[PDB]
Amino acid sequence: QVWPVRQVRPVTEKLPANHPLLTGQRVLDALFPCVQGGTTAIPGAFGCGKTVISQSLSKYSNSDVIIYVGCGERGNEMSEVLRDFPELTMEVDGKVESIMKRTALVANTSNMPVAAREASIYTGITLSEYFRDMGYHVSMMADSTSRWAEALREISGRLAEMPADSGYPAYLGARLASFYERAGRVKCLGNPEREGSVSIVGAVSP
Amino acid sequence: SLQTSFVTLDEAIKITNRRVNAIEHVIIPRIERTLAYIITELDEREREE
Amino acid sequence: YLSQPRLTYKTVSGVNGPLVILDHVKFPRYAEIVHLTLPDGTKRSGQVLEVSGSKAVVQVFEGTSGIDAKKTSCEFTGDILRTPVSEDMLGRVFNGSGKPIDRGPVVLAEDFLDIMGQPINPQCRIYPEEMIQTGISAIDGMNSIARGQKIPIFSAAGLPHNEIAAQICRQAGLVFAIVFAAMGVNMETARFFKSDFEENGSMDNVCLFLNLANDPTIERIITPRLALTTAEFLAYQCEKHVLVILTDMSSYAEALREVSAAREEVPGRRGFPGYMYTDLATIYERAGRVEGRNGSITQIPILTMPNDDITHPIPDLTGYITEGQIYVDRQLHNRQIYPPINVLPSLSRLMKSAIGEGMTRKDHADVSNQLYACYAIGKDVQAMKAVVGEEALTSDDLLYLEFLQKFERNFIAQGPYENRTVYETLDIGWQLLRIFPKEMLKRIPQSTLSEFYPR
Amino acid sequence: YLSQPRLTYKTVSGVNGPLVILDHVKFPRYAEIVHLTLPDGTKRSGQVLEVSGSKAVVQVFEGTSGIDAKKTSCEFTGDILRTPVSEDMLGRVFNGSGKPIDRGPVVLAEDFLDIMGQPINPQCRIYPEEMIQTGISAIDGMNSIARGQKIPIFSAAGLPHNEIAAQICRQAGLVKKENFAIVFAAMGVNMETARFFKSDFEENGSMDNVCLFLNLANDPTIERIITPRLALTTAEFLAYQCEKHVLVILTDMSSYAEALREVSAAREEVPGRRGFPGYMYTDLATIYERAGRVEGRNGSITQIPILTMPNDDITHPIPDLTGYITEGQIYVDRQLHNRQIYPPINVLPSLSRLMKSAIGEGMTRKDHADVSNQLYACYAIGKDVQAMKAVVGEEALTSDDLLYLEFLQKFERNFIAQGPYENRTVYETLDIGWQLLRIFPKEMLKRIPQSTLSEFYPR
Structure with a gap:
């Protein structure tokens, strides 16, 4: 099926979120918890030890699907992520599996078209939102969303607005509002009574 | 001689501090807030031009 | 009546952003209502922004995505935007266009009112003098509100401004319909005002217009107009008292800057349009009492100042139209104070004639003028304590720092379910004024100090 | 291919600044090159800027001073700006348009490559692995550069960043324990630094490694914009088709962006933030992201941009966007140039974000991680003692704060100080770095673990 990306996928009901997004960590589950359906934020810089969370959420959460978004990133910082995701493992039923049986990646370097970022x-x-309508609990990591707002500043000046x-356009807090509101545990539109979720794990760079 | 160099270093420290704090809490925040108004009002003069 | 039939056009001679520019239109009327039919069959509605001879410029509400030049109908209704109003819309949940989303029926209209407003003669208005007891001590003991005052809650992103407002709707009363209007809010805020008005059992008095964050942007131009027209119907024709809650009026102006950008007018201050003053004055001024009618509209909009700047064009142009403001600050929010209300830039321009002897109490106007001057002084001594330290402070300035620890915990800090009366607020305010000796309360005269001070 | 003859119009409809606008053009391409010939005979070149139906707006490279709309003939090409690349252009000096200036002949092409270039597939990149050895101790010992890193040198006007760039080019090589080349692009240089670059690299015997692109300051400001794209398409032939390791030095990338701002405002565009174009982030990115190693080929491209920060500002949008795409910085400092230290490279703010992968056993040596961060701590603790000594005097410093001021007099004059012709190999920037770490005993060196302190301290 083909879906236009700027229209929200229809659900039956946008329920509240009452189940914890459980990482393998002791901090940020005993101190600062997230839910299945909630929206987080992370400062992503060089040497913060950021790659604990992007790889714990991919292996150890109760998520069934990871969707990693790399928007407008560096050249040799995108190739690091594409190098180590097809070798990260996870063990359900004792037998071991690669996590690339449940992740998809969206890789956009800086060299790409500005409108593709x-x-x-x-x-x-x-x-x-396509696996959320199946009933899975998708956890999405949008790495360095402040590079996406660097892309929108160009597209705003591309059209002479x-x-x-x-320097950012008028709709900076509104396209960030029309993105983090597509996260949430919903009741899906359909017959065999499923119930999925989407957690957006943002990443900012002050 | 030891209790008379105490009360000279006890008065000279309690002036310097009131002068590190008079830069941290009075002078340098006033120079920072006029900086955050020049980068704002000149964004406006670029926008009208 | 409009008993002529309507001209259906198929002449779309240009689409550009949120605009649809028609042509060969036969006598087009300004501020008309069209009804566009897209190629796939869906319907959006729009409004004319400019006519010029035979061509019209249509402001499509739901955005012009998918609209082409060949097979897009535009049926011109020949009328300005009139809303259907009734008394049986008290208890419903409409969306930002006025379509119901309560899984119920459409409104069966009692009348058709023009949503843009029709202004009231200032010679025949009543001055709002009867005070609303709101419970919250910061906006009652120092910033009192009368029935008919337009007064915004200035706040920012994250602060509990939607819990401050829902506390007022629980606690408002003298010393009563609610018309709620959500502009660009998230799902969790609209879940909050619903579940609070459900649990309170006042759902037969609330009329909710919800435009969520993914609802289309240019509907937010008409959402406070659709809500206020219901209010001006329920207050001036149904003789009810109305409390109108317009949350995130910042999301009004970002959708008004959006429609003037692609229209390419002359931009004003920070890119906002030129006509932003009279446009917020179109909205905020539909309030107050009138002569010969026993109803009133009390307005509480809610803002978000970006980067907490009170000199942004949204709180600075709102403060020139509304009568006072209620300031919600971030520094008291981090110090776990609810409600975090800074009384130093807060104001009620109708407080002066709504308090006093014969309305609340003799010493109301004198206590609030003295509680102002002690908080405004002890915030300056605190910035003098950061220079010279704790040790170089006189004994009549260890009193002003004593006040700030007891002002923002015993008077300001309330808890979200305290219904503090206007007498319980003042009786708190005198035990803070016994902190000082009698000969420093220099804003209170002798006639009130001899009776109210020594207890 | 392009076998049809070319149309030569004389239908000029107007001149307005550097733009010549033709009309009645038969199917004009975008960004196509034309060749204008003047009334008197002077042939000028230009690139098509905007087509609209039967029109073409042409931006003449060498200006429009003498063009009339009656007798000027503008011959169209039909193909876009391409370069001829060859492996025998290693050892030549070209200008910004790609013509030789070393009394050489025209380069016989092995390929005609489009200089705009296609991006690399992000799946087909490898993380940078080995070391590029420059020979300058301050950027090899403590700020090591990987193979495929993009690390800009941050400096200011008057500072000797141009002799640092010339000393990197004379001594850059591998990390020896046949496939190395250097593409030196010089944008916005004057004449007296153009004959510094042309004379230094040709009589220090290593012209055969380097392919020099010298774009002057008095040359046109459009020819400064195709200069780093000629240099990176040569580097992408030499590395991804001939399996060489290429080091690409772009000199004064703040002079590229002053010629891009000039070309943009003469295209009748409206400026963006600080007057620079709004597409400045995705214009430098088309230059910088032409780097890295590739999957399935044995070459690489490592870039060293060079910047000039105006008024030592870091929030200027030329250092702001360079630090936004590239990985680290080098920070040529002014307080070291006044104290007569060459090369004046500051250590405390400088950083290589891929330095921990360019070092180690089987890449450089086993202690290169533990030596570098130990010299970094003792350089910081000394510079606090350096200021503290002036406050209290020498009689108030102990036998701890004298070991740090005696190290500091020998770290700046032996590790940082090199001289312009002294190629310290990376095995000799550790033995320099160890005989400064012997001023301290083994009870003081906290950043080095004890296993390599037993193997390298006692000698």
Whole structure:
């Protein structure tokens, strides 16, 4: 099926979220918990030890599907992620499996078209709403969403629309509002009574 | 001689501090807030142009 | 009546952003309502922004995505946007266009009112003098609200401004319909005002217009107009008292800056359009009492100042139209104070004539003027304590720092389910004014200090 | 291919600045090159800027001073700007348009490559693995550069960043324990640094490694924009089709962006933030991201941009976007150039974000991780003692704060100080780095683990 990325996929009911997104960590599950359906944020810089969370959420969560979005990233920082995801393992039923039996990736380097990096946040949220309508609990990691807002600043000047706040366009807090509101545990549209979820794990760079 | 160099270093420290704090809490925040108004009002003069 | 039939067009001579520019239109009317039919069969509605001879410029509400030039119908209704109003819309949940989403029926209209408003003669208005007891001590003991005052809750992103507002709707009363309007809010805020008005059992008095975050943007132009027209119907024709809650009025102006960008007018202050003052004055001024009618509209909009700047064009142009403001600050929010209300930039321009002898109590106007001057002074001594340290402070300035520890915990900090009366607020306010000796309360005269101070 | 004859119009409809606008053009391409010939005979070249029906707007490279709309003939090509690449252009000096200036002949092409270039497939990249050895101790010992890293040198006007760039090019090589080349692009240089670059690399015997692209300051400001794209398409022939390891030095990338801002405003575009174009992030990215190793080929491209920060500002949008795409910085410092230290490279702010992968056993040596962060701690603790000594005097410093001021007099004059012709190999920037770490006993070296302290300290 073919779906336009800027239209929300229809659900029956947008229920509240009452189940913890359980990582393997002791902090941020005993101290700062997240839910199945909730939206988080992370500072992603060099040497913060950021790659604990992007690989614990891929292996050890109760998520059934990971959708990793890399929007507008560096050259040799995207190739690091594409190098170590097809060798990360997970063990259910004792037998071991690669996590690339349940992840999809959306890789957008800096060298790409600028309009392909604007539509990498929206491509990864539409794929994540396709498995949410199956009844899975998708956990999506949008790495360095502040590179996406660097892409939207160009597309705003590509069409000659006036810059509003620090060069960014008028709709900076509104396309971030029309993205983090597609996350949530919903009741799916369909007959055999399923119930899925989408957790968006953002990543910002101040 | 030891209790008379105490009360000279006891008065000279309690002036310097009121002068590190008079830069941390009075002078340098006023120079930072006028910086955050020049980068704002000149974003406006680029936008009208 | 409109007993002529309507002209259905198929002449779309240009689409550009949120605009659809028609042509060969036969006598087009300004601020008309069209009804566009897309190629796939779905229907959006729009409004004319400019006519010029034979061509019209249509502001499509739901956005122009998918609209082409060949097979897009535009049926011109020949009328301005009129809403159907009734008294049986008290108890319903409409969306941002006025279509119901309560799984119920459409509104069976009692009348058809123009949503843009029709202004009231200022010679025949009543001055709002009767005070609303709101419970919350910061917006009652120092920033009192009368029935008919337009007064916004200035806040920012994250602060409990939607819990501050829902506390007022539980606690409002004298010393009563609710018309709620959500503009661009998230799902969790609209879940919160619903479940609070459900649990309170006041759902037969609430009329909710919800435009969520994924609802289309240019519906937010008409959402506070569709809500206020219901209010001006329920207050001036049904003689009811109305409390209108317009949350995130910041999401009004970002959808108004959006429609003026692709229209390419002359931009004003921070890219917002030129006509932003009279446009918020179109919305905020539909409030108050009138002569010969026993109903009233009390307005509480809710803002978000971006980067907590009170000199942004949204709180600075709102403060020129509304009568006072209620400030919600971030620094008291981090110090676990609810409600975090900064009384130093807060104001009620109708407080001066709504308090006093014969309305609340003799010493109301004197206590709030003294509780102002002690908080405004002890915040300056605190910034003098950071320079010279704790040790170089006189004994009449260890009193002003004593006040701030007892002002923002015993008077400001309330808890979300305290219904503190206007007398319980003042009786708190005098035990804070016994912190000082009698000969420092220099804003309170002798006639009130001889009776109210020594207890 | 393109076997049809070319149309030569004389239907010029107007001149307006550097733009010549033709009309009645038969199917004009975009970004196509034309060749204008003037009334008197002077042949100028230009690139098609905008087509619209039967029109073409042409931006003449060498200006429009003498063009009339009656007698000027503008011959169209039909193909876009391409370069001829060959492996025998290693050892030549070309200008910004790609013509030789070393009394050489025209390069016989092995290929005609489009200089705009296609991006690399992000799946087909490998993480950078081995070391590029420059010969400057301050960027090999403590700020090591991987194979495929993009690490800009941050400096200012008046500082000797141009002799650092010339000393890297004379001594860059592998990390020896036949496939190395250097593509040096010089944008916005004057004449007296163009004959510094042309004379240094040709009589220091290593012209055969380097392919020099010298774009002057008095040359056109459009020819400064195709200069780093000629240099990176040569580097992408030499590395991804001839399996060489190429080091690409782009000199004064803040002078590229002053010629890009000039070309943009003369294209009748409206400026963005700080006057620079709004597409400045995805314009440098088309230059910088032409780097890295590739999957299935034995070559690589490692880039060293060079910047000039105006007024030592870091929030300027030329260092802001370079630090946003590239991995680390080098920070040529001014307070070291006044104290007469060559090369004046500051250590404390500088960083290589891929340095921990370019070092180690079987890449450089086993202690290169533990030596570098130990010299970094003792350089920081000394520079606090360096200021503290002035506050309290020498009689108030102990036998701890004298070991750090006696190390600091020998770290700046033996590790940082090199001299312009002294190629310290990376095995000799550790023995330099150890005989400064012997001023301290083994009870003081906290950053080095004890297993390599037993193997390298006692000698």
